[PDB]
Amino acid sequence: ATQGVFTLPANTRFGVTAFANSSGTQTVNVLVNNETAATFSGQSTNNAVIGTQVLNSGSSGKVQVQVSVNGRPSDLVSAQVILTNELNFALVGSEDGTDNDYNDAVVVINWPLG
Amino acid sequence: ATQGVFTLPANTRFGVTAFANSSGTQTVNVLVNNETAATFSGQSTNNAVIGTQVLNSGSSGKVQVQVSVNGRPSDLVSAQVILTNELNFALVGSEDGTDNDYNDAVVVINWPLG
Amino acid sequence: ATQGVFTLPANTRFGVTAFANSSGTQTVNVLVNNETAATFSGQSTNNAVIGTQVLNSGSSGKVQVQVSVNGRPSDLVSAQVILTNELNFALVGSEDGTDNDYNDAVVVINWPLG
Amino acid sequence: ATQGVFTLPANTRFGVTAFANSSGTQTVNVLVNNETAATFSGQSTNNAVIGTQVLNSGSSGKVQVQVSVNGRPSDLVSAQVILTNELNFALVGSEDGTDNDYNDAVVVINWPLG
Numbered sequence: 001a002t003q004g005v006f007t008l009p010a011n012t013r014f015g016v017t018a019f020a021n022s023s024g025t026q027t028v029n030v031l032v033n034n035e036t037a038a039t040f041s042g043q044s045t046n047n048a049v050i051g052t053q054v055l056n057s058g059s060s061g062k063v064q065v066q067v068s069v070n071g072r073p074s075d076l077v078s079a080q081v082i083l084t085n086e087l088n089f090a091l092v093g094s095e096d097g098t099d100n101d102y103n104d105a106v107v108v109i110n111w112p113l114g
Numbered sequence: 115a116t117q118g119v120f121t122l123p124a125n126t127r128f129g130v131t132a133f134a135n136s137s138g139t140q141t142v143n144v145l146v147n148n149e150t151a152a153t154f155s156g157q158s159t160n161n162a163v164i165g166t167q168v169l170n171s172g173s174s175g176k177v178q179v180q181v182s183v184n185g186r187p188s189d190l191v192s193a194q195v196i197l198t199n200e201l202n203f204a205l206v207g208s209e210d211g212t213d214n215d216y217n218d219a220v221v222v223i224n225w226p227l228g
Numbered sequence: 229a230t231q232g233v234f235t236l237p238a239n240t241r242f243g244v245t246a247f248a249n250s251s252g253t254q255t256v257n258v259l260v261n262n263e264t265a266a267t268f269s270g271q272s273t274n275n276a277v278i279g280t281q282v283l284n285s286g287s288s289g290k291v292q293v294q295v296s297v298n299g300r301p302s303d304l305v306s307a308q309v310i311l312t313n314e315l316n317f318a319l320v321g322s323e324d325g326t327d328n329d330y331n332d333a334v335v336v337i338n339w340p341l342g
Numbered sequence: 343a344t345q346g347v348f349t350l351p352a353n354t355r356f357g358v359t360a361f362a363n364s365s366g367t368q369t370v371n372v373l374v375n376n377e378t379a380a381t382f383s384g385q386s387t388n389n390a391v392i393g394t395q396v397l398n399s400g401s402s403g404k405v406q407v408q409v410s411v412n413g414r415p416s417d418l419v420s421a422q423v424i425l426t427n428e429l430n431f432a433l434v435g436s437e438d439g440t441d442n443d444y445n446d447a448v449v450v451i452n453w454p455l456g
């Protein structure tokens with residue numbers, strides 16, 4: 001099944017943050033309405049934040065997270081969780097190799113903000 | 115925080131099912147747009163299904179689950195999880211006593227159907 | 229990534245219930261420690277419960293859900309959610325065709341029981 | 343029900359990161375085995391990261407997140423989500439006022455690392 005794709009309420013600000021846990025340099029691309037809206041690049045094996053930014057879901061509300069290492073797409077796992085019918089978390093994990101820890105690039109999207 | 119309240123897409127069919135794990139008789143009430151739409155009553159300490167039904171979220175999409183034992187409201191815990199940005203689960207747990215297993219009445223709402 | 233596999237606490241009773249939403253007959257197989265422990269078969273396009281049963285996670289705690297239609301494995305989506313650090317839900321969705329509603333066979337595993 | 347408490351596997355490294363979305367200064371305290379292990383303090387209404395750190399769950403695996411503003415405990419909401427039976431997210435939201443957006447202090451715990 002497709003992973004890393006989330007439908008957020010339209011024209012809503014959200015945060016996107018990425019953590020790295022791999023020897024390979026992680027390239028995280030965030031698309032809004034199928035167009036790049038943010039790109040984070042970094043390397044860490046200690047969960048360092050390689051990027052964080054505030055974006056707007058726009059008219060479509062479509063947000064997609066892509067993760068690649070040296071141009072090769074990583075395998076993604078994702079899900080959305082809503083707490084008290086208000087607080088949203090769009091979660092993404094990714095695997096660039098064979099150990100399957102799926103934490104090589106961890107992306108967290110949260111809303112609402114403010 | 116409020117628990118057991120979920121905003122579903124409008125006019126969408128969904129399933130609601132309740133399981134019981136308590137000495138006390140569980141009364142599960144499901145409200146749609148603040149009006150009763152289903153009521154399940156049963157007793158089991160072996161996770162028996164005390165009720166299952168198909169409902170429609172209506173114009174408001176507001177769905178609220180209430181659980182009580184002998185007229186006394188149980189304490190609720192809940193959350194919504196979305197898989198592959200399509201499959202939805204609105205989950206509710208409830209505690210009628212002091213052991214805090216929160217499974218006395220377990221309610222699962224799922225959509226889409228068909 | 230692998231889906232439908234969950235590690236439950238050892239020797240713990242859990243419930244497993246399956247719902248069907250497809251023209252095709254759904255075959256849900258539940259494995260505990262890689263050995264069949266339950267099999268549900270049914271057909272419904274109205275979220276009917278095609279099976280529910282209480283199982284024990286055993287010494288390994290490994291539980292895997294398989295879904296197939298006419299012998300063909302469906303594509304699975306899954307996740308585990310824990311509420312108040314006590315109530316557990318192991319969720320599985322499955323797609324047997326091309327519309328991607330992933331509800332053809334919906335499986336819910338819950339614990340603790342009693 | 344109690345919120346903000348999570349049982350992680352013993353002696354496992356995990357990351358904890360906090361975001362702020364409130365006029366009030368957020369004080370996030372992380373306890374491991376009931377003893378303070380990290381404290382973040384900051385103010386932002388734009389989801390700024392007020393802290394991030396790597397901790398070890400220790401022998402007990404008990405991790406608890408506390409959030410307060412000017413010494414007053416905020417109301418918490420939380421849940422744990424596991425993807426592909428490997429990637430873990432312990433999520434916490436908090437409300438310091440009356441608008442109930444529960445994002446005043448957002449805390450994300452993730453593991454495994456490396």
Ligand SMILES: OC[C@H]1O[C@@H](O)[C@@H](O)[C@@H](O)[C@@H]1O
Nearest residue numbers: 021022023024097099101456
């Ligand atoms: O080479 C990539 C590899 O780097 C290691 O340090 C680990 O983080 C692995 O999970 C990852 O797949």
Ligand SMILES: OC[C@H]1O[C@@H](O)[C@@H](O)[C@@H](O)[C@@H]1O
Nearest residue numbers: 135136137138211213215342
């Ligand atoms: O008396 C109510 C009580 O019944 C027991 O059998 C357990 O199921 C408890 O969790 C529940 O609170």
Ligand SMILES: OC[C@H]1O[C@@H](O)[C@@H](O)[C@@H](O)[C@@H]1O
Nearest residue numbers: 228249250251252325327329
């Ligand atoms: O033929 C299989 C097909 O049956 C339909 O009724 C729908 O439930 C589809 O989602 C499913 O894939």
Ligand SMILES: OC[C@H]1O[C@@H](O)[C@@H](O)[C@@H](O)[C@@H]1O
Nearest residue numbers: 114363364365366439441443
């Ligand atoms: O004064 C506290 C208050 O600050 C505002 O800016 C919002 O972030 C509210 O959600 C928050 O409760």
Ligand SMILES: [Ca+2]
Nearest residue numbers: 097100101102
């Ligand atoms: Ca890896």
Ligand SMILES: [Ca+2]
Nearest residue numbers: 021103104456
């Ligand atoms: Ca890794």
Ligand SMILES: [Ca+2]
Nearest residue numbers: 211214215216
């Ligand atoms: Ca109880």
Ligand SMILES: [Ca+2]
Nearest residue numbers: 135217218342
């Ligand atoms: Ca009980």
Ligand SMILES: [Ca+2]
Nearest residue numbers: 325328329330
């Ligand atoms: Ca289908």
Ligand SMILES: [Ca+2]
Nearest residue numbers: 228249331332
């Ligand atoms: Ca279907």
Ligand SMILES: [Ca+2]
Nearest residue numbers: 439442443444
């Ligand atoms: Ca607030």
Ligand SMILES: [Ca+2]
Nearest residue numbers: 114363445446
């Ligand atoms: Ca706020």
